[PDB]
Design a protein around this ligand. Structure first.
Ligand SMILES: Nc1nc2c(ncn2[C@@H]2O[C@H](COP(=O)(O)OP(=O)(O)O)[C@@H](O)[C@H]2O)c(=O)[nH]1
Ligand SMILES: [Mg+2]
Lengths: 393, 303
């Protein structure tokens, strides 16, 4: 789970990490009005999207750059009106972009040098790692590719934790000299503590800044949180606006149904991420385009199949539904009835293909054939694919 | 070192299994299916309820209490995620040879701690978390996979996905090849067993003549396994290997950070060609895994 910059910045502020003092403006005029409440020489404006590369982005309004700075508050609002509502298209987002809504108006600070820094859980390092480069900025990936040996890695022991020598060496490798080496090293340790405190899979500050006045500041905040840790990170997961993605995705989450959309007419429905992806794959092999897919995992509940069909069919772009449940805990002859009832108490005007395989499937598909509803069972995976594609003519 | 405990992955009918979270809803279910399939389940555990009888088997408070009193050599875990990480450490403290954690949703930070000490000991081998389990067709069944699609055969299966694993198992049984040993390593990034560990067992298992590896986009696990076969499965005794990677049609995710790219340098074309370079037959269709491994035997006259 990713949070906006302003939401992360406060987490960093309340945990000893220094960052620019800012104001969140919902409207376009309130961006410049907040630029006055702040009162500072140079102001910085940032579009809030759950993505990076904002600086090198392009708005659908023709605005070049997702981040700008100036000394005139009147200019802040001038750029805010033509930022809010439009889609910012950075190289991390799809070609369409991300609709901007909020804007951050912070106290811009002069930058004497930029360094990249990131804390994260890496499978190769079997735990937390310090990842930094002295030449950071928006061009970090290019510097990391052409000059791979400017990327410094320092594996952290989860039991012992961040050692003073590790933080001191990282700061040195980032080129923090003199008294700043102590300051940067301390901010590194404070970031690692916040990293573990919030169950974050990634904490990235780019650029890990160094002001001409001798201050080490985190100018950018990109945090990826561990979804599995939500049960102990209530306040953190309550911040997710949830309104950037389609309102059907989070509605599907009301019943623990992981949903993602696509561009097609076949609405898939599978009990497993890997299998559900292969489902969308073999459909592509047969000339069909999956509209989306619902993932159940392993648990099977009547309430889910009743809603499931509701969500997929609520998408007017659906012309058929493909059920592929291979390994449910419930004698899926039971959910097989849940498919007949979910369809009867809903009718639906689109065909429906089903492929079940598990605890006594012989009797399970007997309920479907003698039901009287547009249900066409399938024997194997390749079978369900061809039938789904054929039913959209 | 930890690699020593690889051997404990190959269960048989002599392995005496116990269930952590026995009285739980899932622990109760799959324990029944385990006993019905013929698995040697000798009891389970649930804090505060040690001493009662569940499914005709004893219930204990702790693993050591259940182990020494039943001679268990394998333990399966259905504890909820918040306390699943602890259930694993208890088994390691009890020095259980094989621990299979089915629970999904364990915080990565917890598993980083579990894996930290796990790699400092060679007595306990872990599978998972967030995995279907391991099954020796006909002999032992530790996990949630449906046992009515498994025939003891000649093909060893290692899968990173979940329900997708059942496709290869089902398909390999129809063509008549059956399965020698199916193992699901799970989806969580910090787990106790990877592709290489299972490839090490399959290549060293005479009963395993063909191999099927089921991965998917994300990470570099598929590339790592590819480089292993390039070193240990090349030349004279080259066992045929088949694979399918799910998600080659999936869209590209919405990123937020430069860290991922800097560490990678990932999915589909990368994993496919890399796997192929090691000499493995990558099936493009998920439904044509059994048909592929079969003809690979026919091409080499192994049927
Ligand atoms: N001089 C100066 N430059 C800034 C300031 N804030 C941001 N920038 C510039 O804006 C660029 C992009 O900033 P940011 O939004 O944090 O990074 P992103 O993840 O690429 O969007 C940085 O690389 C800096 O060059 C500032 O306060 N002072
Ligand atoms: Mg950045």
């Amino acid at each position: 789970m990713n949070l906006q910059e302003y939401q992360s910045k406060k987490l960093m502020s309340d945990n000893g990490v220094k960052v620019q003092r800012f104001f969140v403006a919902d409207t376009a005029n309130e961006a410049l009005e907040a630029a006055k409440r702040l009162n500072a020489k140079e102001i910085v404006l940032k579009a809030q999207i759950l993505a990076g590369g904002r600086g090198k982005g392009v708005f659908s309004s023709g605005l070049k750059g997702g981040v700008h700075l100036t000394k005139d508050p009147e200019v802040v609002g001038q750029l805010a009106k033509q930022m809010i509502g439009y889609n910012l298209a950075t190289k991390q987002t799809p070609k369409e972009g991300v609709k901007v809504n909020k804007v951050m108006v912070a106290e811009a600070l002069d930058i004497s040098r930029e360094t990249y820094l990131a804390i994260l859980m890496d499978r190769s390092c079997n735990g937390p790692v310090l990842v930094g480069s002295p030449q950071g900025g928006v061009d970090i990936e290019e510097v990391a590719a052409s000059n791979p040996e400017l990327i410094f890695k320092e594996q952290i022991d989860i039991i012992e934790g961040i050692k003073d020598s590790q933080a001191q060496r990282m700061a040195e490798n980032l080129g923090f000299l003199g008294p700043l080496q102590n300051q940067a090293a301390d901010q590194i340790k404070k970031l690692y503590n916040l990293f573990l405190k919030i169950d974050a899979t990634q904490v990235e500050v780019n650029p890990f800044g160094e002001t001409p006045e001798g201050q080490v500041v985190c100018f950018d905040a990109k945090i990826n949180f561990d979804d599995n840790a939500e049960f102990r990170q209530k306040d953190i997961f309550a911040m997710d606006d949830k309104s950037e993605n389609e309102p059907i995705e989070n509605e599907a989450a009301k019943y623990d149904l992981k949903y993602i959309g696509l561009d097609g007419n076949i609405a898939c429905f599978v009990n497993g991420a890997g299998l559900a992806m292969a489902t969308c794959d073999i459909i592509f092999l047969n000339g069909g385009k999956p509209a989306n897919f619902l993932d159940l995992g392993g648990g099977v509940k009547e309430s889910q199949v009743y809603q499931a069909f509701k969500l997929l069919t609520a998408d007017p772009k659906v012309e058929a539904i493909l059920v592929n449940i291979f390994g449910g805990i419930v004698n899926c002859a039971i959910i097989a009835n849940g498919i007949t009832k979910a369809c009867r108490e809903l009718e639906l005007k689109v065909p429906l293909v089903v492929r079940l395989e598990g605890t006594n499937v012989h009797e399970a598909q007997n309920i479907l054939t003698n039901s009287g509803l547009p249900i066409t069972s399938a024997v194997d995976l390749e079978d369900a694919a061809k039938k789904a594609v054929a039913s959209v003519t | 070192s930890y690699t020593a405990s690889r051997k404990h992955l190959y269960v048989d009918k002599n392995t005496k299994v116990i269930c952590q979270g026995f009285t739980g809803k899932q622990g109760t279910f799959h324990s029944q299916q385990a006993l019905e399939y013929g698995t040697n389940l000798v009891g389970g555990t649930t804090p505060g309820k040690g001493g009662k009888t569940h499914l005709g088997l004893p219930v204990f408070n702790t693993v050591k209490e259940a182990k020494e009193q039943t001679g268990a050599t394998a333990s399966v875990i259905y504890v909820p995620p918040p306390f699943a990480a602890a259930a694993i450490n208890e088994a390691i403290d009890a020095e259980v040879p094989l621990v299979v954690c089915i629970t999904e949703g364990i915080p990565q930070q917890d598993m980083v701690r579990v894996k930290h000490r796990l790699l400092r000991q060679g007595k306990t081998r872990l599978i998972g978390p967030n995995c279907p389990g391991v099954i020796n067709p006909g002999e032992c069944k530790i996990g949630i996979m449906p046992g009515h699609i498994h025939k003891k055969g000649r093909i060893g299966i290692v899968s990173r996905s979940g329900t997708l694993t059942y496709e290869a198992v089902h398909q390999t049984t129809q063509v008549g090849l059956g399965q020698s040993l199916c193992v699901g390593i799970g989806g969580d990034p910090f787990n106790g067993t990877d592709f290489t560990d299972c490839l090490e067992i399959f290549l060293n298992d005479p009963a395993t003549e063909g191999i099927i590896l089921i991965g998917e986009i994300g990470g570099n696990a598929e590339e790592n396994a590819a480089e292993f076969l390039k070193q240990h499965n090349s030349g004279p005794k080259s066992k045929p290997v088949v694979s399918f990677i799910a998600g080659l049609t999936a869209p590209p995710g919405r990123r937020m950070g430069h860290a991922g790219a800097i560490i990678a340098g990932g999915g589909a074309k990368e994993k496919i060609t890399a796997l192929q370079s090691a000499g493995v037959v990558v099936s493009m269709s998920p439904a044509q895994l059994g048909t592929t491994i079969y003809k690979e035997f026919e091409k080499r006259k192994m049927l």
